[PDB]
mmCIF file of all heavy atoms in Angstrom:
data_model
loop_
_atom_site.group_PDB
_atom_site.id
_atom_site.type_symbol
_atom_site.label_atom_id
_atom_site.label_comp_id
_atom_site.label_asym_id
_atom_site.label_seq_id
_atom_site.Cartn_x
_atom_site.Cartn_y
_atom_site.Cartn_z
ATOM 1 N N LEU O 1 4.187 2.482 -2.929
ATOM 2 C CA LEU O 1 3.548 1.183 -2.625
ATOM 3 C C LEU O 1 2.425 0.767 -3.638
ATOM 4 O O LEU O 1 1.937 -0.371 -3.541
ATOM 5 C CB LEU O 1 2.945 1.252 -1.197
ATOM 6 C CG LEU O 1 3.881 1.471 -0.085
ATOM 7 C CD1 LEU O 1 3.114 1.862 1.190
ATOM 8 C CD2 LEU O 1 4.711 0.178 0.139
ATOM 9 N N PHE O 2 2.103 1.646 -4.551
ATOM 10 C CA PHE O 2 0.976 1.335 -5.442
ATOM 11 C C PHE O 2 1.327 0.228 -6.497
ATOM 12 O O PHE O 2 2.458 -0.168 -6.589
ATOM 13 C CB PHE O 2 0.535 2.604 -6.195
ATOM 14 C CG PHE O 2 1.552 3.114 -7.229
ATOM 15 C CD1 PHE O 2 1.461 2.707 -8.530
ATOM 16 C CD2 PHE O 2 2.539 4.020 -6.821
ATOM 17 C CE1 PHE O 2 2.365 3.181 -9.448
ATOM 18 C CE2 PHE O 2 3.411 4.503 -7.736
ATOM 19 C CZ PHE O 2 3.355 4.123 -9.034
ATOM 20 N N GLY O 3 0.322 -0.283 -7.161
ATOM 21 C CA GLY O 3 0.603 -1.328 -8.184
ATOM 22 C C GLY O 3 1.055 -2.655 -7.639
ATOM 23 O O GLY O 3 1.683 -3.446 -8.298
ATOM 24 N N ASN O 4 0.695 -2.923 -6.392
ATOM 25 C CA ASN O 4 0.873 -4.248 -5.785
ATOM 26 C C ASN O 4 -0.426 -4.877 -5.438
ATOM 27 O O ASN O 4 -1.354 -4.235 -4.959
ATOM 28 C CB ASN O 4 1.782 -4.191 -4.563
ATOM 29 C CG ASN O 4 3.243 -3.920 -4.882
ATOM 30 O OD1 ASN O 4 3.973 -4.799 -5.391
ATOM 31 N ND2 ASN O 4 3.712 -2.724 -4.612
ATOM 32 N N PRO O 5 -0.593 -6.211 -5.608
ATOM 33 C CA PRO O 5 -1.784 -6.955 -5.333
ATOM 34 C C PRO O 5 -1.884 -7.246 -3.815
ATOM 35 O O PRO O 5 -1.840 -8.418 -3.374
ATOM 36 C CB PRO O 5 -1.633 -8.224 -6.105
ATOM 37 C CG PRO O 5 -0.155 -8.454 -6.072
ATOM 38 C CD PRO O 5 0.462 -7.098 -6.152
ATOM 39 N N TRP O 6 -1.920 -6.165 -3.030
ATOM 40 C CA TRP O 6 -2.095 -6.347 -1.553
ATOM 41 C C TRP O 6 -3.253 -7.251 -1.222
ATOM 42 O O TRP O 6 -4.379 -6.963 -1.591
ATOM 43 C CB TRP O 6 -2.196 -4.963 -0.891
ATOM 44 C CG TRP O 6 -1.092 -4.036 -1.156
ATOM 45 C CD1 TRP O 6 -1.097 -2.902 -1.850
ATOM 46 C CD2 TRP O 6 0.306 -4.232 -0.801
ATOM 47 N NE1 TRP O 6 0.138 -2.330 -1.914
ATOM 48 C CE2 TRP O 6 1.030 -3.109 -1.282
ATOM 49 C CE3 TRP O 6 0.982 -5.210 -0.086
ATOM 50 C CZ2 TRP O 6 2.401 -2.967 -1.055
ATOM 51 C CZ3 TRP O 6 2.320 -5.092 0.158
ATOM 52 C CH2 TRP O 6 3.014 -3.935 -0.390
ATOM 53 N N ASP O 7 -2.943 -8.330 -0.477
ATOM 54 C CA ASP O 7 -3.955 -9.276 -0.108
ATOM 55 C C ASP O 7 -4.655 -8.783 1.178
ATOM 56 O O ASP O 7 -4.154 -8.959 2.311
ATOM 57 C CB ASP O 7 -3.306 -10.693 0.150
ATOM 58 C CG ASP O 7 -4.344 -11.738 0.363
ATOM 59 O OD1 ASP O 7 -5.517 -11.467 0.294
ATOM 60 O OD2 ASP O 7 -3.896 -12.871 0.693
ATOM 61 N N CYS O 8 -5.800 -8.148 1.006
ATOM 62 C CA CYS O 8 -6.523 -7.608 2.165
ATOM 63 C C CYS O 8 -7.440 -8.585 2.888
ATOM 64 O O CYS O 8 -7.917 -8.340 3.984
ATOM 65 C CB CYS O 8 -7.315 -6.356 1.719
ATOM 66 S SG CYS O 8 -6.268 -5.027 1.173
ATOM 67 N N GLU O 9 -7.700 -9.717 2.220
ATOM 68 C CA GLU O 9 -8.496 -10.774 2.867
ATOM 69 C C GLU O 9 -7.737 -11.486 3.929
ATOM 70 O O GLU O 9 -8.289 -12.186 4.818
ATOM 71 C CB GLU O 9 -9.023 -11.815 1.826
ATOM 72 N N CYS O 10 -6.380 -11.315 3.963
ATOM 73 C CA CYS O 10 -5.564 -11.948 4.978
ATOM 74 C C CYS O 10 -5.289 -10.950 6.112
ATOM 75 O O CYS O 10 -5.292 -9.774 5.989
ATOM 76 C CB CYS O 10 -4.196 -12.369 4.365
ATOM 77 S SG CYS O 10 -3.048 -13.128 5.548
ATOM 78 N N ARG O 11 -5.157 -11.480 7.410
ATOM 79 C CA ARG O 11 -4.981 -10.681 8.570
ATOM 80 C C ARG O 11 -3.576 -9.992 8.569
ATOM 81 O O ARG O 11 -3.453 -8.909 9.161
ATOM 82 C CB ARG O 11 -5.241 -11.486 9.822
ATOM 83 C CG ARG O 11 -5.169 -10.721 11.089
ATOM 84 C CD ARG O 11 -6.248 -11.076 12.063
ATOM 85 N NE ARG O 11 -7.531 -10.561 11.699
ATOM 86 C CZ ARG O 11 -8.693 -10.999 12.178
ATOM 87 N NH1 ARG O 11 -8.699 -11.970 13.045
ATOM 88 N NH2 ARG O 11 -9.825 -10.431 11.765
ATOM 89 N N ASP O 12 -2.643 -10.596 7.884
ATOM 90 C CA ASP O 12 -1.289 -10.096 7.833
ATOM 91 C C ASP O 12 -1.235 -8.630 7.291
ATOM 92 O O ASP O 12 -0.249 -7.933 7.504
ATOM 93 C CB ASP O 12 -0.403 -10.997 7.030
ATOM 94 C CG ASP O 12 -0.208 -12.355 7.722
ATOM 95 O OD1 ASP O 12 -0.589 -12.496 8.896
ATOM 96 O OD2 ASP O 12 0.337 -13.297 7.001
ATOM 97 N N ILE O 13 -2.199 -8.315 6.512
ATOM 98 C CA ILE O 13 -2.234 -6.937 5.843
ATOM 99 C C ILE O 13 -2.342 -5.846 6.975
ATOM 100 O O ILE O 13 -2.132 -4.673 6.618
ATOM 101 C CB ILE O 13 -3.402 -6.790 4.862
ATOM 102 C CG1 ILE O 13 -3.133 -5.671 3.868
ATOM 103 C CG2 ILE O 13 -4.708 -6.562 5.575
ATOM 104 C CD1 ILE O 13 -1.813 -5.820 3.100
ATOM 105 N N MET O 14 -2.752 -6.193 8.117
ATOM 106 C CA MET O 14 -3.038 -5.205 9.158
ATOM 107 C C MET O 14 -1.826 -4.311 9.430
ATOM 108 O O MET O 14 -1.998 -3.119 9.686
ATOM 109 C CB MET O 14 -3.626 -5.844 10.388
ATOM 110 C CG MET O 14 -5.105 -6.257 10.225
ATOM 111 S SD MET O 14 -6.133 -4.945 9.698
ATOM 112 C CE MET O 14 -5.841 -3.670 10.957
ATOM 113 N N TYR O 15 -0.639 -4.905 9.551
ATOM 114 C CA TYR O 15 0.541 -4.097 9.775
ATOM 115 C C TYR O 15 0.673 -2.969 8.737
ATOM 116 O O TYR O 15 0.851 -1.792 9.101
ATOM 117 C CB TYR O 15 1.817 -4.871 9.815
ATOM 118 C CG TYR O 15 3.046 -4.022 9.846
ATOM 119 C CD1 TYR O 15 3.272 -3.195 10.939
ATOM 120 C CD2 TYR O 15 3.924 -3.926 8.763
ATOM 121 C CE1 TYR O 15 4.374 -2.332 10.965
ATOM 122 C CE2 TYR O 15 5.017 -3.117 8.803
ATOM 123 C CZ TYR O 15 5.248 -2.286 9.882
ATOM 124 O OH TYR O 15 6.374 -1.465 9.919
ATOM 125 N N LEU O 16 0.666 -3.345 7.481
ATOM 126 C CA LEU O 16 0.736 -2.355 6.373
ATOM 127 C C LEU O 16 -0.398 -1.343 6.580
ATOM 128 O O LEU O 16 -0.181 -0.126 6.484
ATOM 129 C CB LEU O 16 0.676 -2.990 5.027
ATOM 130 C CG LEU O 16 0.684 -1.963 3.881
ATOM 131 C CD1 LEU O 16 1.956 -1.125 3.934
ATOM 132 C CD2 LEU O 16 0.485 -2.623 2.534
ATOM 133 N N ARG O 17 -1.635 -1.851 6.748
ATOM 134 C CA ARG O 17 -2.788 -1.004 7.005
ATOM 135 C C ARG O 17 -2.502 0.056 8.046
ATOM 136 O O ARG O 17 -2.665 1.243 7.889
ATOM 137 C CB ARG O 17 -4.024 -1.810 7.369
ATOM 138 C CG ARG O 17 -5.326 -1.020 7.485
ATOM 139 C CD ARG O 17 -5.566 -0.650 8.947
ATOM 140 N NE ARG O 17 -6.747 0.228 9.043
ATOM 141 C CZ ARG O 17 -6.823 1.288 9.857
ATOM 142 N NH1 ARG O 17 -5.840 1.559 10.684
ATOM 143 N NH2 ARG O 17 -7.870 2.046 9.842
ATOM 144 N N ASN O 18 -2.063 -0.437 9.211
ATOM 145 C CA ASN O 18 -1.753 0.442 10.351
ATOM 146 C C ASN O 18 -0.622 1.359 10.074
ATOM 147 O O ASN O 18 -0.674 2.587 10.391
ATOM 148 C CB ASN O 18 -1.449 -0.388 11.595
ATOM 149 C CG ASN O 18 -2.699 -1.083 12.147
ATOM 150 O OD1 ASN O 18 -3.787 -0.634 12.010
ATOM 151 N ND2 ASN O 18 -2.428 -2.237 12.776
ATOM 152 N N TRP O 19 0.401 0.880 9.385
ATOM 153 C CA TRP O 19 1.575 1.692 9.012
ATOM 154 C C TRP O 19 1.270 2.889 8.113
ATOM 155 O O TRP O 19 1.613 4.001 8.394
ATOM 156 C CB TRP O 19 2.615 0.820 8.387
ATOM 157 C CG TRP O 19 3.899 1.573 8.207
ATOM 158 C CD1 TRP O 19 4.898 1.749 9.183
ATOM 159 C CD2 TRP O 19 4.347 2.371 7.106
ATOM 160 N NE1 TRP O 19 5.940 2.567 8.668
ATOM 161 C CE2 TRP O 19 5.594 2.965 7.457
ATOM 162 C CE3 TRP O 19 3.765 2.553 5.819
ATOM 163 C CZ2 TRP O 19 6.287 3.667 6.519
ATOM 164 C CZ3 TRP O 19 4.504 3.311 4.938
ATOM 165 C CH2 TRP O 19 5.746 3.880 5.286
ATOM 166 N N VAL O 20 0.451 2.577 7.056
ATOM 167 C CA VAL O 20 0.034 3.681 6.193
ATOM 168 C C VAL O 20 -0.805 4.712 6.942
ATOM 169 O O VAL O 20 -0.608 5.910 6.799
ATOM 170 C CB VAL O 20 -0.725 3.129 4.930
ATOM 171 C CG1 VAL O 20 -1.336 4.353 4.124
ATOM 172 C CG2 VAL O 20 0.117 2.251 4.088
ATOM 173 N N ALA O 21 -1.751 4.232 7.739
ATOM 174 C CA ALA O 21 -2.505 5.113 8.597
ATOM 175 C C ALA O 21 -1.642 6.000 9.494
ATOM 176 O O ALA O 21 -1.977 7.182 9.680
ATOM 177 C CB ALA O 21 -3.483 4.326 9.481
ATOM 178 N N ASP O 22 -0.550 5.490 9.946
ATOM 179 C CA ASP O 22 0.330 6.234 10.891
ATOM 180 C C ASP O 22 1.350 7.113 10.116
ATOM 181 O O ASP O 22 1.968 7.979 10.700
ATOM 182 C CB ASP O 22 1.076 5.240 11.745
ATOM 183 C CG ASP O 22 0.165 4.610 12.838
ATOM 184 O OD1 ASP O 22 -0.781 5.317 13.257
ATOM 185 O OD2 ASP O 22 0.438 3.469 13.262
ATOM 186 N N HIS O 23 1.434 6.931 8.761
ATOM 187 C CA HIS O 23 2.408 7.641 8.044
ATOM 188 C C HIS O 23 1.914 8.185 6.665
ATOM 189 O O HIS O 23 2.559 7.996 5.677
ATOM 190 C CB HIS O 23 3.646 6.745 7.750
ATOM 191 C CG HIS O 23 4.301 6.219 8.995
ATOM 192 N ND1 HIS O 23 3.876 5.068 9.646
ATOM 193 C CD2 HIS O 23 5.295 6.703 9.699
ATOM 194 C CE1 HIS O 23 4.603 4.916 10.721
ATOM 195 N NE2 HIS O 23 5.512 5.851 10.772
ATOM 196 N N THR O 24 0.710 8.753 6.705
ATOM 197 C CA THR O 24 0.000 9.193 5.533
ATOM 198 C C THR O 24 0.849 10.153 4.676
ATOM 199 O O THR O 24 0.723 10.146 3.441
ATOM 200 C CB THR O 24 -1.341 9.902 5.899
ATOM 201 O OG1 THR O 24 -1.032 10.995 6.766
ATOM 202 C CG2 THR O 24 -2.276 8.912 6.581
ATOM 203 N N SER O 25 1.634 10.975 5.332
ATOM 204 C CA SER O 25 2.391 12.010 4.594
ATOM 205 C C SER O 25 3.543 11.514 3.785
ATOM 206 O O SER O 25 4.112 12.262 2.987
ATOM 207 C CB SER O 25 2.902 13.055 5.624
ATOM 208 O OG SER O 25 3.758 12.442 6.560
ATOM 209 N N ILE O 26 4.015 10.284 3.958
ATOM 210 C CA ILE O 26 5.161 9.789 3.196
ATOM 211 C C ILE O 26 4.782 8.762 2.109
ATOM 212 O O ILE O 26 5.680 8.400 1.337
ATOM 213 C CB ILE O 26 6.215 9.236 4.134
ATOM 214 C CG1 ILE O 26 5.777 7.917 4.711
ATOM 215 C CG2 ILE O 26 6.565 10.225 5.210
ATOM 216 C CD1 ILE O 26 6.889 7.151 5.413
#
């Protein structure tokens, strides 16, 4: 997932945020 301009100022980022938190090992 690295090397992408993830827009964190937008609320839509929260799914990705939550997903990574829930799947740190992959």
